[PDB]
Design a protein around this ligand. Structure first.
Ligand SMILES: N[C@H]1CO[C@@H](CN2CCOCC2)[C@@H]1O
Length: 339
């Protein structure tokens, strides 16, 4: 379709201009009031904040520089900020400000109050096939966009997909995203979602995102992921085997699509063949999908999250509230010069 080719050509032109001249230092910490911790990790946190002058709410990701250095995440944190400031697509969370101080890196993005897909999936049990298909179509379009820019996402999972006020997906967490022409080698991601070629320490490409989409669709429709175990080594053994059992309630069309996404041989995996994304878009499981209407956000969503307003945190869970310290002395200045 010529309209698709022209769209992706303009998309790449716009990305490259921002990629080659990244924005920096567009706010500071005392421009915001801290409200609540929404998530915590080994080197960072995400906090709901309110901008003092405008009253707007935002999700502020705070990374501790010294912990990023120790856990060998410098390049990944630079990737994340540089990619986020350059992308633009209806299902990607928008970065509004970024800055750094003596202690931390900060990425201030739109706040999506409906909460993580993970919470809704566990609350409901499983999504019906039409419900799963609505979300999957948004991921297919998002990967078509990212891959055309030579980006690999590398962290698809339900906790990274936020549900907005219209019931549509906002992809968050670009911490593992990378611009790759050809192959890349880093071991990263969540065990249940890793493609076989990552587990086997191969040079890998965008096919790993299409494998992860197969895992996600299976998990949405079944309520649990296809490969699971107490120990990661046991998970990896199941993944590298070409074995997957489907629940009897799965449609024949769903099983066929998943056999082609969860294909252990990356040279035979849907998304990585001569016809690229179109082998997925034209598959029978997507026969009812109006791709243009999804992109234009004209389809009624299967559900709308319950929340009271743009500052409501009821769809997120409770964490110990810790200080945001800013050291009197600068830490790791050289390492983060480009941020
Ligand atoms: N994967 C988690 C961790 O980071 C959070 C980021 N979002 C950004 C937009 O608003 C809500 C919070 C996600 O909940």
């Amino acid at each position: 379709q010529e309209s698709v080719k022209e769209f992706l050509a303009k998309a790449k032109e716009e990305f490259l201009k921002k990629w080659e001249s990244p924005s920096q230092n567009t706010a500071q910490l005392d421009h915001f009031d801290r409200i609540k911790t929404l998530g915590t990790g080994s080197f960072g946190r995400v906090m709901l904040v309110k901008h003092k002058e405008t009253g707007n709410h935002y999700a502020m990701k705070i990374l501790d520089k010294q912990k990023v250095v120790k856990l060998k995440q410098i390049e990944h944190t630079l990737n994340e900020k540089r990619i986020l400031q350059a992308v633009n697509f209806p299902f990607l969370v928008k970065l509004e400000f970024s800055f750094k101080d003596n202690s931390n890196l900060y990425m201030v993005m739109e706040y999506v109050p409906g909460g993580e897909m993970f919470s809704h999936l566990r609350r409901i049990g499983r999504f019906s096939e039409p419900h799963a298909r609505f979300y999957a179509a948004q991921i297919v379009l998002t990967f078509e966009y990212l891959h055309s820019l030579d980006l690999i996402y590398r962290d698809l999972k339900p906790e990274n997909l936020l549900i907005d006020q219209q019931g549509y997906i906002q992809v968050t967490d670009f911490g593992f995203a990378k611009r790759v022409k050809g192959r890349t080698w880093t071991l990263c991601g969540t065990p249940e979602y890793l493609a076989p070629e990552i587990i086997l320490s191969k040079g890998y490409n965008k096919a790993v995102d299409w494998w992860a989409l197969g895992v996600l669709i299976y998990e949405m429709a079944a309520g649990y992921p296809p490969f699971f175990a107490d120990q990661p080594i046991q998970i990896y053994e199941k993944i590298v085997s070409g074995k997957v059992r489907f629940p009897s309630h799965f449609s024949s069309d769903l099983k066929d699509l998943l056999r082609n996404l969860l294909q252990v041989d990356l040279t035979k995996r849907f998304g990585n063949l001569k016809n690229g994304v179109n082998d997925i878009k034209n598959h029978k499981w997507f026969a009812t999908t109006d791709w243009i209407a999804i992109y234009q956000r004209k389809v009624e969503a299967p559900f709308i999250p319950k929340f009271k307003g743009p500052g409501d945190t009821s769809n997120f869970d409770d964490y110990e509230e810790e200080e945001i310290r800013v050291s009197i002395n600068e830490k790791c200045g050289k390492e983060f010069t480009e941020f």
